[PDB]
């Protein structure tokens, strides 16, 4: 490699990289750095004593919790699949090493890890792009880019669909490298008011992001919704078009913020006063902290300029094809919500001074509205009364619904501006969606996000069991005692098939009782006790109340059915709807035109998504968050390890393996008659009376099936300790034999000295002797 700006961007090894013995070098656990490099000093069984290389200190550590260190031969590697040791300790290393040096990418084997910078990096430039263009994953250093190429490459020549699902925690890098993958794939395959299809595709983020993203402690720009953009290519491998598909907007945020969070960015920028010539178009007063719906949490995200992100937003509309009409409408309806929020009011209307702004914006009447919001209608057709709450939360629902109905318009609208009918042949659809989140308290909100992931966790697993079969044959074994996967469909069925809680909360919303036991029971009586996953709540940290409990891939999660019916349908004053439905605003009217619960709508949104992905040859990018504080170049010891345990570190009920070598150097003591690497092990089992199905003897390693290994470990430990006893009885029996002649002679000794004395007495007791002595002069 020669080098323009591959520098603090890609590998960088001639200006940095310039004593090791894998017998004393190893990693021990460290409460501070996760693990720590140290040297082994002494042994005493399960008490391997060592000196901490670093601070040169001393401590004891179980021979087990110690982990092998990789020779310096693999420092800052680029395919941790190559390292000698791909274990839990060494992986944390090779990544932190790279991370501190600003390489922010790594291919641990068939993956593409990506520790978040939290700093702007110079590695996405056109120069760098082209230096990555067309190149094989190996002739070029790790980098998101080539992750996308190999897709296009394969798409073109392998003629199929490609998918790059980027998944990480929150604030990791997902909704970031997702953009780079579109922006790249578009720098390379270009085709040629309204801007360029290229420009549009790209520009269509500040909008979607403007309405669907907000501040979360974890992340200033958290993506409150899922996204799945496809990118089709023409019969000449050119961008023929793209189509978006957002999943599960967080309706609830529109009116509430946990402290330390903000509402969807826009709202805040709308009061930014970026385009003053609009304050009066929306009736807004450039002040965020003045509208109850957006000022509940923090009002500003450090390093996120609203005024600008506003101007940039607007611009974006221009380029998507939006008009001055459509555009401004968007804003208006958005602006309105702020006010829908201010309508003050047991008590009924307290002033109407603002409720009017809402009246004007949505292009309908102050009277009709302000009226229906208190005295609405409905087989019988009546009029009802609503109180202090039967109205406030009635407004809450108004806004949310609007913002929601709106968002969908925004996507749908955007999918129109890039619907060009150029001929389509294969697509490269990136997918940026959140992940299995399990809060202290979990509801319908969470069951969704998660259920969604459940199906995704089966896609990955389906695809991993595939390469499995590809390791099963190279080192040539067919080993099909496949029997598996059921446990993942288990939770999957219980969540989407007909009789699952997911059609119940859907038909139990048709049934006109709609009360929370009418459902918080329907399930029970249908799945309570009748499942392995579904179970009554458990019993721990600071968790809230939870009704049924799911056995998700990531684990068991408690769920609260309180108010799901409502959360599932859309409880707006059907009264106001039609009031809106018939309006003088092209949007509002459209927004409320002439099934669809939040979930039979997801049922498909998702059934659809999968059917796409399963038509692709996937590519995974695992984003990892380095630390809470968010400063670039830092590593939260644990935090990382944690993540590294939930993706691909290498599993779920598959047969384990061992290079034939190491099987000898570990389990030979088990079948002791041997003295060739692979034949040594090749024997042991046979003699160990091993049932032949429990294993297969491929050429590089041995594949075992369950705890067959664990059964060995267990056997080993039982044996190792018997020998030890045996060697001890040998020491024991040796002594008893050393001290055996002294044992025999003494018996002669204690016979001379009893008999004699036992005579010498008789004699002192002999009448004659007595006499004799009396006479002894």
């Amino acid at each position: 490699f020669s080098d323009p700006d591959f520098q603090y961007l890609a590998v960088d090894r001639k200006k940095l990289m310039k004593a090791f013995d894998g017998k004393k070098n190893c990693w021990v656990p460290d409460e501070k750095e996760g693990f720590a490099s140290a040297e082994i000093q002494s042994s005493k069984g399960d008490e391997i004593t060592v000196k901490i290389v670093a601070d040169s200190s001393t401590r004891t550590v179980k021979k087990d919790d110690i982990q092998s260190m990789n020779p310096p031969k693999f420092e800052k590697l680029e395919d941790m699949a190559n390292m000698t040791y791909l274990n839990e300790a060494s992986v944390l290393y090779n990544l932190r090493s790279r991370y501190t040096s600003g390489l922010i990418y790594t291919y641990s084997g068939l993956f593409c890890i990506a520790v978040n910078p939290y700093r702007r990096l110079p590695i996405y430039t056109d120069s760098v792009i082209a230096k990555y263009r067309g190149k094989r994953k190996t002739e070029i250093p790790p980098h998101l880019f080539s992750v996308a190429d190999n897709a296009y490459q394969n798409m073109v020549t392998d003629r199929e669909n490609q998918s790059c699902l980027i998944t990480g925690e929150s604030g990791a890098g997902k909704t970031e490298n997702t953009k780079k993958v579109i922006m790249y794939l578009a720098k390379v395959a270009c085709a040629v008011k309204e801007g360029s299809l290229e420009d549009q595709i790209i520009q269509a983020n500040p909008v979607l992001e403007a309405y669907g993203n907000a501040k979360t402690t974890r992340n200033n720009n958290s993506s409150r919704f899922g996204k799945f953009i496809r990118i089709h290519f023409g019969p000449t491998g050119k961008i023929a078009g793209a189509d978006i598909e957002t999943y599960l907007l967080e309706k609830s945020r529109v009116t509430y913020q946990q402290s330390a969070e903000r509402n969807y960015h826009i709202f805040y920028q709308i009061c930014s006063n970026a385009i003053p010539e609009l304050n009066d178009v929306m009736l807004v007063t450039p002040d965020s902290g003045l509208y109850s719906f957006i000022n509940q949490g923090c009002l500003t995200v450090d390093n996120i300029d609203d005024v600008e992100e506003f101007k940039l937003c607007d611009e974006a509309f221009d380029i998507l094809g939006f008009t001055k009409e459509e555009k401004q409408s968007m804003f208006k309806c958005t602006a309105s919500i702020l006010h829908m929020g201010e309508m003050k009011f047991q008590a009924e209307s307290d002033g109407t001074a603002e409720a009017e702004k809402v009246a004007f914006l949505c292009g309908i009447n102050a009277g009709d509205l302000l009226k229906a919001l208190l005295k609405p209608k409905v087989t019988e057709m009546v009029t009802k009364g609503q109180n202090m709450n039967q109205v406030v939360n009635s407004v809450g629902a108004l806004a949310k619904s609007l913002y929601d109905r709106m968002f969908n318009w925004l996507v749908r609208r955007v999918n129109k501006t890039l619907d060009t009918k150029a001929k389509r042949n294969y697509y490269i659809g990136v997918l940026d969606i959140a992940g299995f989140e399990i809060f202290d308290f979990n509801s319908f909100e969470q069951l969704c996000i998660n259920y969604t992931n459940e199906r995704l966790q089966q896609f990955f697993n389906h695809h991993m069991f595939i390469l499995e079969q590809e390791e099963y044959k190279k080192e040539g074994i067919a080993w099909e005692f496949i029997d598996f996967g059921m446990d993942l469909q288990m939770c999957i069925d219980l969540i989407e098939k007909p009789m699952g809680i997911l059609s119940i909360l859907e038909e139990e919303c048709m049934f006109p009782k709609a009360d929370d036991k009418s459902f918080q029971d329907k399930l029970y009586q249908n799945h309570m006790g009748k499942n392995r996953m579904f179970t009554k709540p458990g019993k721990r940290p600071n968790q809230g109340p939870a009704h049924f409990e799911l056995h998700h891939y990531a684990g068991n999660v408690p769920y609260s059915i309180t108010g799901w019916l409502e959360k599932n349908k859309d409880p707006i004053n059907e009264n106001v709807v039609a009031l809106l439905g018939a309006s003088k605003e092209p949007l509002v009217a459209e927004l409320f035109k002439a099934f669809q619960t939040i979930s039979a709508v997801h049922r498909e949104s998702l059934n659809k998504l999968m059917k796409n992905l399963y038509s692709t040859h996937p590519h995974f990018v695992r984003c990892i968050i380095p630390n809470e504080l968010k400063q670039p170049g830092l590593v939260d010891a644990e935090l990382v390890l944690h993540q590294l345990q939930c993706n691909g570190v290498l599993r779920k009920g598959f047969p384990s393996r061992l290079i034939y070598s190491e099987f000898k150097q570990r389990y030979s003591i088990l079948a002791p008659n041997a003295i060739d690497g692979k034949t040594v092990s090749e024997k042991i089992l046979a003699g160990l009376q091993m049932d032949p199905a429990e294993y297969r003897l491929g050429t590089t390693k041995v594949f075992f099936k369950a705890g067959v290994l664990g059964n060995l470990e267990e056997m080993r430990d039982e044996r190792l300790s018997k020998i030890i006893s045996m060697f001890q009885a040998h020491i024991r029996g040796y002594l008893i034999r050393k001290a055996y002649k002294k044992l025999q002679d003494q018996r002669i000794g204690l016979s001379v000295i009893q008999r004699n004395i036992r005579k010498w007495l008789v004699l002192r007791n002999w009448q004659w002797w007595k006499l004799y002595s009396k006479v002894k002069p």
Binding site: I753, Q754, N756, K759, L761, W766, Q767, W769, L771, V775
Partner: protein, 142 residues
């Protein structure tokens, strides 16, 4: 035993008061009744029945010899002890032999154990078998 005989004879005479060249029933009940507590009658009678014919000197050393016929020497003895002196200290800390003798070999019975230590030579816990042997069998006094 050559010159032990020099004594037997000595004893015989100082014993044979009437010096009836023979040790008589009245010959004992005399010399005894002369020094210490003399024996009874059957006591005496059993002393004579212990000798085939009249008590001439011969018949005298004869009854004695049998009574010393199966004793091991002062070596086969003094060394039979030392086998337990590991240290070559000329002593068996008391309790050791006390237990050796009683709860091992052919277990020494109570009174059998009592008379053997009645006068045995004991010091600072130790036990001088060296002396105790030179007493049990033989040397040092008369």
């Amino acid at each position: 035993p050559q010159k032990q005989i020099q004594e037997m004879k000595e004893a015989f005479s100082m014993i044979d008061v009437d010096r009836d060249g023979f040790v008589s029933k009245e010959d004992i009940k005399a010399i005894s009744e002369q020094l210490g507590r003399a024996p009874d009658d059957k006591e005496l009678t059993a002393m004579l029945k212990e000798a085939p014919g009249p008590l001439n000197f011969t018949m005298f050393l004869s009854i004695f010899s049998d009574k010393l016929s199966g004793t091991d020497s002062e070596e086969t003895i003094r060394n039979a002890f030392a086998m337990f002196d590991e240290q070559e200290t000329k002593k068996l800390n008391i309790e050791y032999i006390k237990d050796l003798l009683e709860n091992m070999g052919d277990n020494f019975n109570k009174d059998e154990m009592r008379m053997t230590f009645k006068e045995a030579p004991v010091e600072g816990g130790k036990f001088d078998y060296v002396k105790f042997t030179a007493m049990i069998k033989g040397s040092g006094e008369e």
